[PDB]
Amino acid sequence: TIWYQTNFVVPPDTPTEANIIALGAAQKNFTLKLCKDT
Amino acid sequence: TMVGQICRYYTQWSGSLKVTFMFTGSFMATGKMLIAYTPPGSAQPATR
Amino acid sequence: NIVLSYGEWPEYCPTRPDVSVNRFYTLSTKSWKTESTGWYWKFPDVLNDTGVFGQNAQFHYLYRSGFCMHVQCNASKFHQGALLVAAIPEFVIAASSPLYPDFAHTNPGKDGQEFRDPYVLDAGIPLSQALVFPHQWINLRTNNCATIIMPYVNALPFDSALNHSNFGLVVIPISPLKYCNGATTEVPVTLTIAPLNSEFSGL
Amino acid sequence: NIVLSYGEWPEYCPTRPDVSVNRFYTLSTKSWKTESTGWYWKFPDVLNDTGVFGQNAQFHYLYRSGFCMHVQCNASKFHQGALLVAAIPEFVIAASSPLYPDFAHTNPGKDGQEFRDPYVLDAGIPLSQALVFPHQWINLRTNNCATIIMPYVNALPFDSALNHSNFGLVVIPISPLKYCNGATTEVPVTLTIAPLNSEFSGL
Amino acid sequence: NIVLSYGEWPEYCPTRPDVSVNRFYTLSTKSWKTESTGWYWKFPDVLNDTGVFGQNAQFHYLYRSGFCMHVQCNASKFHQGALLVAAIPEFVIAASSPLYPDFAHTNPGKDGQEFRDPYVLDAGIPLSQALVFPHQWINLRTNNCATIIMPYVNALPFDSALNHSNFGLVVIPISPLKYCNGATTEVPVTLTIAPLNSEFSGL
Amino acid sequence: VNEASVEHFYSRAGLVGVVEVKDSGTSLDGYTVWPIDVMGFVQQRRKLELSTYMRFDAEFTFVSNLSNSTTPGMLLQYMYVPPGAPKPDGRKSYQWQTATNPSVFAKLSDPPPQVSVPFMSPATAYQWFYDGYPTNLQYGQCPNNMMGHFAIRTVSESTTGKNVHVRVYMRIKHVRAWVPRPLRSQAYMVKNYPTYSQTITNTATDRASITTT
């Protein structure tokens, strides 16, 4: 989960909303077993 | 994600994952976020 | 950069808590408005409820610790104003009369308390000379952050966590916050405190 | 910093053009509006008309090359938004149906083409997974520029420049452009491409 | 003297609890009357409520441990009768029909449960052959006490403490208790259990 | 640079109290008790509060006479009740015996009695500021700063008609002081408590303008 710790702070003449993007991946130790149709 | 689509071709999987967060706002913006992770047994937090 | 209070690092003099009790505890964020005056937390009180630290401090009879406390502020380059952060040992507040201070004032909890009379620090002592205590400045143009390490200072080797407060942390805005229209009104002030070399006795 | 596509540098496997054909070719600037979606050039096609490179590629029978391609963006500090740049080998567009794609879509020329359906990349494949190709990010707060080197990848040693396109370059604005009033509306996006180790045969 | 179950000592394969979780836990005393039949505790279940062990086992996700369990009996020299103590891994009780066993029977808690049908061990298997499990005898003329050490035995390296019970401890009076008039009617049977090499994971 | 030491700044003997036995008048009681209080005056209270903790040995002197500033020979008893012992109820009370309670017998004719009290605290130092409850009134109090009560008496069969005035002086010896504290701007309200008045007095005096002798 993602929580607001503080309010979103901007100087004047600046847009008040923004975005965040997440990127998923697996590590080196990730493994797979017994192939199956999708 | 690509890890999620090629898990649908297999019956079992195990290991560690990572997640990356990019903030796309203006160079002038400032603030803080709190990013929490709850283990498999527990329900999600009610409060900050 | 970093302030060692009275030139010393905290150290052991019991059960010694490990990483579970020594982590960072981020308190809810204060908003500093142009009209705002002051805050004071006065811990060990602040962590007696929260987390594993609060579990140990309540059910053990005697207590010792020292704290790293990091104060930091999010503002743009169009905001101005200055803060003063100080750690005052045995900070005993008072009543202003038209008489005892109320428990909500003496032990404010995890949310701190507001100063009525910051100019006297609500002790009847001048704020001008509060620089005699370990202190740091936050000037929004120069820097956003202040950090102070406080060793354990008391007359006794150990004492109780619930009755006695060892010191208190005061954050005061000597120079008020000004910003031109269109800017964010409130400037957040957040507080992160990590206890160091904490010992408990008499479970 | 700099992306080597699939870990390799371009190299020779004919007449070898020198500095006349290996210079930088700056294409006309694209304007990225808050409403804009996507562009794709799909070269060798883009340089078949322009300059000395275009002279060689038309009148020689067989072709080989590799490209350095530099994408860069001019915006102030009050503009936000993010781009994704990718180089996809054998990028075959499609038709959306209410059926063949039109030649102006398949071979867009030196001015590129607009995406109708960037979310599927107009291939019916997710944009989410386009990161499997060699890619770079442009975040207007972090950086203005992206650079990718693509070696020659084909099944055949040489092939024709006019019929076959080896890859395509896609520039997509995943996070839209936002700016407060008074700021410049359009943010220019310019594209500079230098071919590396290019060979021609069968004049 | 002392029974090592299956010839092994418990050992580590996470957070490792220390002396707080490894102490002796003395359960409330059972009274063995001349009419009495049997008891079974079936732990890890028995300590999930009590003490620090119960605190760890509930809020951690995975679990591993092994137990020392000491059964001892207070009787005079004018009392007779014999007990059999056994530790049976994966002890799965059953229903007798005129059909699932009730949760109060499967997970009896810290107070254990009574056998209806000790002769079949409420599993449909003979009590005669329960000596195939790790076992000890208490004959009131020979000895008052029995001690068994059980290592961790499961198919998985770790498992959950709340859902799965690793084994169960059965105390059965094969030869009934007889005493001449004037003697104390009930003979107390007390149970002390110390966990060994216990590990917890996934707080 | 020796006069700026912490040990020289606390040096001298000074008047820590004034008390009277008064068996002459409507009060025939004929004795008095004086709990030892270092801060009884606001001039010395403000110098001590420059430090949070401090540790010292004390030296007491008793300057005694009559209302005429005349000193005829007549016998007085100066007892000392250490912390944790009962005080006398009256002239003839048994606490005036009690060998553990140190006492001094001196005539008014003699030069002032003098005696030396050690460091009496259970803590390693005296706390002039305590933030906490020892167990409303209880906030900020140190039960362990108590030094004992003295209690002068005239040794008399019954009822002399003379009032005896006695002045107490204290020295601070072997003083050691810990973390410093600013000096109080506001006037004091009550003895024990920090409380100050609702009308704040400025620290520095006013001038006509910021520009300006």
Cα-based radius of gyration of chain C, to the nearest Å: 17 Å
As an assembly, this protein is part of a larger assembly
Number of helices of chain A: 0
Would you list the SSEs of chain C in sequence order as H and E? EHEEHEEHEEEE
User: Into which percentage range does the β-strand content of chain A fall?
Assistant: 35-45%
Please tell me the CATH architecture of chain C by its name.
Sandwich
| Gross morphology of chain C | globular
End-to-end CA span of chain C? 39 Å
Family (chain B): Belongs to the picornaviruses polyprotein family.
Protein name (chain B): Genome polyprotein
Subcellular location (chain B): Host cytoplasmic vesicle membrane; Host nucleus; Virion
Organism (chain B): Coxsackievirus A6
Describe this protein's structure:
- It is classed as virus.
- The entry lists the keywords Coxsackievirus A6, A-particle, icosahedral, virus.
- The entry is titled "Structure of Coxsackievirus A6 (CVA6) virus A-particle".
- The structure is cut from a larger assembly and holds two copies of chain A, three copies of chain C (203 residues) and one copy of chain F (213 residues).
- Chain A has 38 residues and is mainly β.
- Chain A contains no helices and three strands.
- The two termini of chain A are 29 Å apart.
- Chain C has 203 residues and is mostly beta strands.
- Chain C has a single domain (1-203), classed as Sandwich (Jelly Rolls), CATH 2.60.120.20.
- In chain C, strands 1-7-4-9-2 form a five-stranded mixed beta sheet, with no helix packed on it.
- Chain C is globular, with a radius of gyration of 17 Å.
- The N and C termini of chain C lie far apart (39 Å).
- With 213 residues, chain F is mostly beta strands.
- Chain F has one domain (1-213): Jelly Rolls (Sandwich).
- Chains in contact: A-B, A-C, A-D, B-C, B-D, B-E, C-F.
- Chains A and C meet through loops of A and strand 2 and strand 9 of C.
Question: Topology of this protein?
Answer:
The structure is cut from a larger assembly and holds 2 copies of chain A, 3 copies of chain C (203 residues) and 1 copy of chain F (213 residues).
Chain A: E1 2-4, E2 20-26, E3 31-35
Chain C: E1 3-4, H1 19-22, E2 25-32, E3 39-40, H2 51-59, E4 62-73, E5 82-89, H3 103-106, E6 135-139, E7 145-150, E8 167-175, E9 187-201
Parallel strand pairs in C: 1-7
Antiparallel strand pairs in C: 2-9, 3-8, 4-7, 4-9, 5-6, 5-8
Chain F: H1 6-9, E1 14-20, H2 42-48, E2 53-65, E3 75-79, E4 103-107, E5 114-117, E6 126-127, E7 152-154, E8 165-177
Family (chain B): Belongs to the picornaviruses polyprotein family.
Protein name (chain B): Genome polyprotein
Subcellular location (chain B): Host cytoplasmic vesicle membrane; Host nucleus; Virion
